[PDB]
Amino acid sequence: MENDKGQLVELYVPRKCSATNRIIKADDHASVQINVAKVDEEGRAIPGEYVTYALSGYVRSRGESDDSLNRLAQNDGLLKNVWSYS
Amino acid sequence: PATFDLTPEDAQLLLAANTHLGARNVQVHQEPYVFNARPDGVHVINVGKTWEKLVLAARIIAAIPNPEDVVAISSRTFGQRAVLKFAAHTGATPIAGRFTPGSFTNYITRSFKEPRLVIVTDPRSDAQAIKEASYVNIPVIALTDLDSPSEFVDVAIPCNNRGKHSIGLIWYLLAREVLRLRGALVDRTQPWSIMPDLYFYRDP
Amino acid sequence: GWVPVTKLGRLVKAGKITTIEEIFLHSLPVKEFQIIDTLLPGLQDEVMNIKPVQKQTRAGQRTRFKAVVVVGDSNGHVGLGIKTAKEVAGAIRAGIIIAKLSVIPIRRGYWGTNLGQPHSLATKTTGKCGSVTVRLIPAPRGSGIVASPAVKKLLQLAGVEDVYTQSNGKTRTLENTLKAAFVAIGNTYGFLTPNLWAEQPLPVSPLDIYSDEA
Amino acid sequence: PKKRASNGRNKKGRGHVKPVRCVNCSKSIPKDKAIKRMAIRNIVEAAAVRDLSEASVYPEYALPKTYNKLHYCVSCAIHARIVRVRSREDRKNRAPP
Amino acid sequence: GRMHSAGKGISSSAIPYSRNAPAWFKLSSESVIEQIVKYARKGLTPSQIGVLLRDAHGVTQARVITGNKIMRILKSNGLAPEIPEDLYYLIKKAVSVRKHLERNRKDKDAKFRLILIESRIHRLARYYRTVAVLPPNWKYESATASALVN
Amino acid sequence: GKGKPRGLNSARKLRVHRRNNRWAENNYKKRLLGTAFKSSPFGGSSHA
Amino acid sequence: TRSSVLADALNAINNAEKTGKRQVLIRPSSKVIIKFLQVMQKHGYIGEFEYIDDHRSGKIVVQLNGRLNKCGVISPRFNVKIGDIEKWTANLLPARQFGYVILTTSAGIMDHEEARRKHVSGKILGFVY
RNA sequence: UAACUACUGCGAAAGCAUUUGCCAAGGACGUUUUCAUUAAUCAAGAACGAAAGUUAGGGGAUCGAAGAUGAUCAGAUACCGUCGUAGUCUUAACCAUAAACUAUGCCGACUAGGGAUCGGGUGCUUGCACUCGGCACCUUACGAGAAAUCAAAGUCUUUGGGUUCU
RNA sequence: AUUCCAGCUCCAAUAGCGUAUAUUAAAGUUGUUGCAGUUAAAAAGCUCGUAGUUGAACUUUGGGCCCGGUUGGCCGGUCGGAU
Numbered sequence A: 001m002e003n004d005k006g007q008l009v010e011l012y013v014p015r016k017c018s019a020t021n022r023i024i025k026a027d028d029h030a031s032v033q034i035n036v037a038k039v040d041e042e043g044r045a046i047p048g049e050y051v052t053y054a055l056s057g058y059v060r061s062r063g064e065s066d067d068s069l070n071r072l073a074q075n076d077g078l079l080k081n082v083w084s085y086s
Numbered sequence B: 001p002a003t004f005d006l007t008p009e010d011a012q013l014l015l016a017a018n019t020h021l022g023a024r025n026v027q028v029h030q031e032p033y034v035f036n037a038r039p040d041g042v043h044v045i046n047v048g049k050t051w052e053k054l055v056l057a058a059r060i061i062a063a064i065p066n067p068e069d070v071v072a073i074s075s076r077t078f079g080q081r082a083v084l085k086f087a088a089h090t091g092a093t094p095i096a097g098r099f100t101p102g103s104f105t106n107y108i109t110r111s112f113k114e115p116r117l118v119i120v121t122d123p124r125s126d127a128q129a130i131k132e133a134s135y136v137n138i139p140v141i142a143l144t145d146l147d148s149p150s151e152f153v154d155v156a157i158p159c160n161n162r163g164k165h166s167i168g169l170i171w172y173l174l175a176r177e178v179l180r181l182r183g184a185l186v187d188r189t190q191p192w193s194i195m196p197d198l199y200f201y202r203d204p
Numbered sequence C: 001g002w003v004p005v006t007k008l009g010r011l012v013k014a015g016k017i018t019t020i021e022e023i024f025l026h027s028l029p030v031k032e033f034q035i036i037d038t039l040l041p042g043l044q045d046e047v048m049n050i051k052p053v054q055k056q057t058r059a060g061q062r063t064r065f066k067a068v069v070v071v072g073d074s075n076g077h078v079g080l081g082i083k084t085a086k087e088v089a090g091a092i093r094a095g096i097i098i099a100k101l102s103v104i105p106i107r108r109g110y111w112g113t114n115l116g117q118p119h120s121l122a123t124k125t126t127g128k129c130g131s132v133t134v135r136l137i138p139a140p141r142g143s144g145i146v147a148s149p150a151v152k153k154l155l156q157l158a159g160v161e162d163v164y165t166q167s168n169g170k171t172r173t174l175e176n177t178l179k180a181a182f183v184a185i186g187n188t189y190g191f192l193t194p195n196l197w198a199e200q201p202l203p204v205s206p207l208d209i210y211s212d213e214a
Numbered sequence D: 001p002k003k004r005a006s007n008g009r010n011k012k013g014r015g016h017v018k019p020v021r022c023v024n025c026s027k028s029i030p031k032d033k034a035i036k037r038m039a040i041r042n043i044v045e046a047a048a049v050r051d052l053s054e055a056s057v058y059p060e061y062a063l064p065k066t067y068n069k070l071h072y073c074v075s076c077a078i079h080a081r082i083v084r085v086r087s088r089e090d091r092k093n094r095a096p097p
Numbered sequence E: 001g002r003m004h005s006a007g008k009g010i011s012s013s014a015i016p017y018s019r020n021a022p023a024w025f026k027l028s029s030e031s032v033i034e035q036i037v038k039y040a041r042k043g044l045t046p047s048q049i050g051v052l053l054r055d056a057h058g059v060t061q062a063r064v065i066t067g068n069k070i071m072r073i074l075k076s077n078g079l080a081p082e083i084p085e086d087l088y089y090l091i092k093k094a095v096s097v098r099k100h101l102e103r104n105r106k107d108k109d110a111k112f113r114l115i116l117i118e119s120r121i122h123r124l125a126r127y128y129r130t131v132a133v134l135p136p137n138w139k140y141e142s143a144t145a146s147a148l149v150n
Numbered sequence F: 001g002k003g004k005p006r007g008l009n010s011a012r013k014l015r016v017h018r019r020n021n022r023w024a025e026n027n028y029k030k031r032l033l034g035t036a037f038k039s040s041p042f043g044g045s046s047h048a
Numbered sequence G: 001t002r003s004s005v006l007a008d009a010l011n012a013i014n015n016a017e018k019t020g021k022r023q024v025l026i027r028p029s030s031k032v033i034i035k036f037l038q039v040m041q042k043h044g045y046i047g048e049f050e051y052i053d054d055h056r057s058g059k060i061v062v063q064l065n066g067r068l069n070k071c072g073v074i075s076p077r078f079n080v081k082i083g084d085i086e087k088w089t090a091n092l093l094p095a096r097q098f099g100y101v102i103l104t105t106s107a108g109i110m111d112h113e114e115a116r117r118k119h120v121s122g123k124i125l126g127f128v129y
Numbered sequence H: 001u002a003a004c005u006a007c008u009g010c011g012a013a014a015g016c017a018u019u020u021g022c023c024a025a026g027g028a029c030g031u032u033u034u035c036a037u038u039a040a041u042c043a044a045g046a047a048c049g050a051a052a053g054u055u056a057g058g059g060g061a062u063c064g065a066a067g068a069u070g071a072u073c074a075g076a077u078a079c080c081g082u083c084g085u086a087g088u089c090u091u092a093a094c095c096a097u098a099a100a101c102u103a104u105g106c107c108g109a110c111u112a113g114g115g116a117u118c119g120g121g122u123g124c125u126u127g128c129a130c131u132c133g134g135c136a137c138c139u140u141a142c143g144a145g146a147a148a149u150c151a152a153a154g155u156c157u158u159u160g161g162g163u164u165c166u
Numbered sequence I: 001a002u003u004c005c006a007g008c009u010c011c012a013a014u015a016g017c018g019u020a021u022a023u024u025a026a027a028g029u030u031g032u033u034g035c036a037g038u039u040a041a042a043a044a045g046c047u048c049g050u051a052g053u054u055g056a057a058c059u060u061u062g063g064g065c066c067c068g069g070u071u072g073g074c075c076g077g078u079c080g081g082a083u
C-alpha cells in the first residue's frame, strides 16, 4: 500500500504461510517459523545461514504441518526421497 | 551431501532395535511413511524416510543459537532416561516425568521455560506440552508412530514407540547428529564412543 | 522500576527491538504489559462500561464489578481489556493491563483514490461475538465514524477517520459489541488483498538475532 | 432441552416397535426402551446345597438353573436400583458394569 | 435418486472411452445388422437383442460397430413397435397390478403401487406426444390397457 | 436454497407471498381492515 | 437435481481454498465454467487448469495459489444496465480498488472493468476476490 | 405370536415377527443391454393414514372406560383391592386425527478421521480386504450455533444451486 | 420523597416549545437486496400430482495480418498548453 507520491503507508507487511500463502496475523500464536541450518561441505552447519519456512496455526491445527514441511523441504533439497506428488 | 545418508552400520541399529516395526490395524492417514503391511497386522516403517527426517530434525536443533533453549520432553517411562542423556550431551534442558501445566504459559510458575524448540517421545502421552506449545509460537519435533496424532507437530520422525530400545535409539541417533553438526565429533563416519545401550531404560 | 522476567521484555529494556511492528511481524507472544508501555508511549485509555455481576450464595447477592477498557494511540493501534473484581478501581487498573496486552494493528486504507495518507479501512470486514455482529465498511473523506457511541470510541482510538458500520444482534450487550468490533478491526490485517501478493523472503526473529542478550 | 441423543430408547431405523409389560407393575413399555436383565440362578439356593446333596439320592447329577428374562419399566428399574441416576458425562457410557 | 422412492442407488453401465472400436472384433457392420434384424422378426425387443449380441456374439455396443442405434436399425427395416418399448413394459406392469386388485381389494399397498406405475405411464406418454412418436390424442385408459399390450 | 423462490421469472410468487405475510403485521392489518373508522371511539380522529 | 453447473464448480473451489488445498476436481465442465476460470487466471487468482476429456461433460483440475478469498455465482443471472454495475460492485466486492464482478455480455464473459472500457453490459454471472 | 430379539431388517408414512403355499409388488447390487432430457419441487386436486370413536352383521377367552364394590382419607363416586358394560377381535362402511417426533421439508453438489454392522458385488488363499447401497455409531471441529449441541443444525453481512410449506 | 405540590438553583431547545392522532426512518420486527422454522412462533402424518417456478453437457476456436483511433508518452522545454 503506497500513496500517490510512492511511500509505503502500510504500518507493516505481514508474513505468509509457506504451505498456504495465508497471512499470519499478529495474534496467531500457533504460527511457527522453523529455521533449518545450511550445512556446508563436511557437514558442520553455519552460524546464521538458515532455510526459513513459516507455517500458519491453521495448517498445524489440521495435522498438515508435517506433510507441508516434507514438501517444502524436498523442493529446497533438504530431503531427497520423502514427499511424493502422486 | 552424499556422505550424510544411511550408512549400513546405522541400518543395523534401526533393524536391531525394531524401530522399523509400526502400529497394526490402526494407521493414521497423515502417514505415507510406510513400506508395506506384513503377513501379520503390523506395518513396516520406511527407515530410509526415518533417517532423512532424523537428519532434518537434527539440522533444526543445530540451527538454535543457545542450546539450552531446546527442551526434550518425556512423560513415558521408556523415554525418561533418553531425554536426560540428550540434555547432558546436546546442552538442552529436559523435562522428565510430570510436565506441569502452565509451564510455557504462566510466567509466575517455578518451571517456566521459554524454549525455541520442543522434542517429544510420544505426542499422545505428552499431549499437554504439544497443546501448550501452540499457545506461544513454539515449533515441535515428535518421535511419532503410525497411529500417533499429528496436530501441532511440525517435523515427525516415524518410528516404533512401543519398544524400549527403539525410543532410546532414535534419541541416541538424534543426539549424535546434532553433535556431528557443530564442531564436536568431527566424524567422517566414526561410530562414536558412547553406545546406544546407554540411552535405554534401566529396569530395576 | 520494572525488572523483566520474559525474553521479549529483556530485548525491550535493552532497546534492541525499537517498535511494536517487529513484535507483530513475528507474532511474538506479549506477556508483560510494560513491553507495550515502553514501545508505544502515548497510549490513551478509556473505560466504556462498568457492570455489577452477582453470584448467588446462601448469604445472598455477592457482587463483583466487570470493567471494559479500551486503549489506543489514535494511529493504528488499539486494545480491549475485560476484567471483573471485588472493587471497581481494582477492576479498571487490571483492565488497562489486559487492554495493553491485547493491543493489535489496524490496516487503514483509502475509500477510492490513493491520494494522501490513509483515512478509512482497506476493505469490508466483520466480526461476530455472541449474537452481535459488526460490519465495518470503508467510507469517503468527511464521513466521520458512523457508529454507535461505544463502537465510535474504539474506532477513534484505533485512529480511523471515516467508516460506515452496520450491526446485527443484541447490540445492547455492550461487552459482546465491543469484542465483535475488536475482531473486525483485528481482521483488517487478516484479509489478503492483491497489493500484499508480492512474495517476501521471511525475516529472522529478534529471538534468534539478539539471542545472547535474552 | 434434549437429554439423550437416543431419546432414552433404541429405535432409529423403524416406525413402531411392539410393547412389553413391566414385570413389577405391568406398565406397557416399548421393547427397545425396556430395561432388560437376564436373571440366572440355581433352583436350589446356596447354603441349601449342603443339606440337599446329603439327602440327594444319586450324586448331585446337575443342580439346574432358572432362566427368566426380566423386562422393567423406567420407574420400577430406578426404584429397585436395577439402574441409577448418572452425571451428564457418565450418562454417555454404554458399558455393562 | 429414484423417481418414486427414497432409493439413491447408482448402479449402471459404464460405456468405455473408445468410440471407434474394437480391434479384436472381426465380424463386419453389414453382418451384425442381419443378426439384429433376424432377432427382430423372431419377436424380440431392442434391449433383448443387444443382450444376445453382448453375450453369444462379441458385439460391445451396436452403435460402435454398426454406426446406428438398434432402434434406428429396426425403424429402417420396418420392425418398429406401435408404442415404445419402455412404455409397453410399464403398461404390462399396470395391467398385472390392476388385474391383481380385482381379486384383492384389501391389498392397500397394491392400490398405492398402482398409483405410482400409472403416474409413470402418464409422464412417459406426455413425453412421447411432445416428440411425436405417439399421436397427439394418445391416452392411457385402464379399461383398454389389456387390449393394447396383449 | 433459502426456502423462497430465486428464479428470474418468479416475481409473481414473491409479490403474492409478501402480500399474504403482511397481514401478520399489526399496523398493516389495522390500516387495511379500517379498524380506526369501524371500531375505535374517536373514529380515527386525534381528539373528540 | 443439478441446476447450476457453474455454482457447483465455484462452490468446490471455495471449499478447497478454505481447507488450504492446492488443487480441486470439478465436474461437470462447461464453456461457461472455462470462460469464468480464464477471467480468474488473467487476474492471477488461480494457476493452471486442465480439462479432462471423458467423452461426456468433462472434468477440470484447477490449481490454487492461496490468493482467492471468495469466488461465487449470482443466481438468478439478473439483467444489468450499464448504469447499475456500480450498485452490484458496491454490494458484492470488499473494496473499490480490487475484486471483479463477472458478466455475460454479447461482447463476451468478462470482468466489470473490461465492461466499463468496452462500454457493454448484459447479465451478471458471479464475482471473484 | 414369548424366549431367539439387537443402537438388526423391510415399508411413503401409519406400521410390519409361528409354518408352508399362491398372487402380484419393491429396493440395492451387477451390466461394453435400451430410450435419450422423458427431470426436481409442486397451488388446485387425489391415495394411504396408530389408537380411540361411529353404523350394521359375526365373535365375545383376557383385560377393562362407565358402573358396581372393599379399604384408605376431614372428604376420596382417586390412586390400592374384587367384579364388570361398551370396548378390546373380525366383515362391510365411516372417521382423518396423535409428543402421526429425528419436535429437523424434498432434490443436487462439496467439506474429516475412525472402526463396527446389513444387503449385493469383486479379489482371493476362504476370512479378511476393497467396493456400491443402507440402518446407525465413535473422535474432533475445520466450520456452525443464544447455548444445549450439530458431519449436518457446515460450505450465511466474504450474505444468491433449485423448489414447496409455515 | 434525587420522581408528587411548591421555592431556589440548574439543563435543553428558543420566537418558539409542548401535547394528541396518523405516517416514514429506527425495522435484517415483512427480509428482492435481506429474517426465521431441532428446543424461543413456525417443516404439511405420508406419498402421488396439474398449473407455477426451475432444469446436465455439446455446434468458429485459435492463429497470421493490416489500417485508421484514445490516453500516458518521450524532450511539456515558459511548472500551462502544443506536435
Ligand SMILES: [Mg+2]
Binding pocket: D015, D016
Ligand atoms: Mg411413531
Ligand SMILES: [Mg+2]
Binding pocket: E001, E008, E010
Ligand atoms: Mg445420484
Ligand SMILES: [Mg+2]
Binding pocket: E003
Ligand atoms: Mg417427485
Ligand SMILES: [Mg+2]
Binding pocket: none
Ligand atoms: Mg393441498
Ligand SMILES: [Mg+2]
Binding pocket: none
Ligand atoms: Mg396436528
Ligand SMILES: [Mg+2]
Binding pocket: I035, I036
Ligand atoms: Mg424475527
Ligand SMILES: [Zn+2]
Binding pocket: D022, D023, D024, D025, D026, D027, D072, D073, D074, D075, D076, D077
Ligand atoms: Zn414398572
